[PDB]
Amino acid sequence: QELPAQVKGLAAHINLSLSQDLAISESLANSYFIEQWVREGLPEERQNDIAAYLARLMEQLDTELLFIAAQHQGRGYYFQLRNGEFLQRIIQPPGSEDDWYYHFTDSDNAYELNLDSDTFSPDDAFVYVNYRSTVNAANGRPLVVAGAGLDLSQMASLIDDFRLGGSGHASLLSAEGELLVRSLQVHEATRDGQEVLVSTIWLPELQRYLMVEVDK
Amino acid sequence: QELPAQVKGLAAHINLSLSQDLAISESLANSYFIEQWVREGLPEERQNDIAAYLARLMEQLDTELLFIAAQHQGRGYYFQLRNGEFLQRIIQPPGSEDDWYYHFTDSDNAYELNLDSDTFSPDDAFVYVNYRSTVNAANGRPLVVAGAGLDLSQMASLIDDFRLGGSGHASLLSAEGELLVRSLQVHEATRDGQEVLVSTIWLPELQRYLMVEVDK
Numbered sequence A, B: 001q002e003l004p005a006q007v008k009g010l011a012a013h014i015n016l017s018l019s020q021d022l023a024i025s026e027s028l029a030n031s032y033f034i035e036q037w038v039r040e041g042l043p044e045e046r047q048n049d050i051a052a053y054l055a056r057l058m059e060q061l062d063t064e065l066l067f068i069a070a071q072h073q074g075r076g077y078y079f080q081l082r083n084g085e086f087l088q089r090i091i092q093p094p095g096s097e098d099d100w101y102y103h104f105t106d107s108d109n110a111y112e113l114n115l116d117s118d119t120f121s122p123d124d125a126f127v128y129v130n131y132r133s134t135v136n137a138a139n140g141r142p143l144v145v146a147g148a149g150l151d152l153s154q155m156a157s158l159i160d161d162f163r164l165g166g167s168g169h170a171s172l173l174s175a176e177g178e179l180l181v182r183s184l185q186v187h188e189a190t191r192d193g194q195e196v197l198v199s200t201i202w203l204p205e206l207q208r209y210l211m212v213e214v215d216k
């Protein structure tokens, strides 16, 4: 049976791409230079530097968004490099859209992959790689929560990266059944028109399932 | 046949570990802060900072050695964090042991995994993750060549990480037959005493082959 092993290998491909992104996100969240920039009071004079730094990562990871959420004097600051623009704002109280932060920082997870609409542009939704810094602020929250906001179209192109015979559909869903993107125990099911074979597997790094259809 | 697929999966495990190391090495070689420290003339005043920075990576990658080779005014400087010590020296001409540099910088490879004896301590030999910076100096050489020096004992523990049935031996060799470490088309060969099954596969990221023996 080539199809099950092929599904496992493609899942491994997705895993290694996300793992490169995750390692870079951890190194960014625990960056000594970013922590020193935070302790210095986040001077605007060095912002350009910071931008360049994040640029060097965006070129390597090919991700649309890069974000840094810093804590200083009890205030949270959200910075984002995207499309050459370096945007900055203040993190909102838990009653607004930034409650995700209060979520991830209240969980004991070192990292989570939460899908959410962008706070600078609510129209676009991204898959955010929230990684927590080892250092904690005086209020108990992570000093830095940095990572990469992935454009879901890329998600579509890297699952469309490999196709079995050039046909079939590959889908990636969430744990509640919310579908994220579209291009072990294998089963056979009759689809509308013609029958197909389906087989699913769950990714722990993404917290999310993966299905695939194949005909002849 | 479970053994071939198991060999492929363990090779994938080795690949993903080395890939985390490689991504961190690339981000370090193309670090904007390191490049600014180089352009500033490599001030000793900031050395502590640099050290801390590299420390933050060594804690994440669990690698014995971290190295940075910088170019400034036509002179090459070799820095290494290891065991809490921040060592620094001048890169030797091609007639000495640093010729590896002139090798890797003369190849069009973005990165190479060269095994070599340490230049600060010739007794210990490491597997060096040489990654080239995108920026080039005025003399045409990479402005920064940074990465991680892996202790081969770790290499032994991550191939001993997974064992089939708790028996058998897994070996990793070079392209000339030089064995690196010890714990597709499968073949059967009679070893001294009792017969065994052997199957090998080549890793492109490591440029190196992988064998494995199994009895019953």
Ligand SMILES: Nc1nc2[nH]cnc2c(=O)[nH]1
Pocket (backbone or CB within 6 Å): A067, A100, A101, A114, A115, A116, A117, A118, A119, A128, A129, A130, A149
């Ligand atoms: N909306 C939103 N923006 C983010 N920026 C970083 N992480 C997130 C997240 O989870 N949601």
Ligand SMILES: Nc1nc2[nH]cnc2c(=O)[nH]1
Pocket (backbone or CB within 6 Å): B067, B100, B101, B114, B115, B116, B117, B118, B119, B128, B129, B130, B149
């Ligand atoms: N000896 C030695 N030291 C290194 N430091 C970084 N790369 C190397 C290498 O290839 N050889």
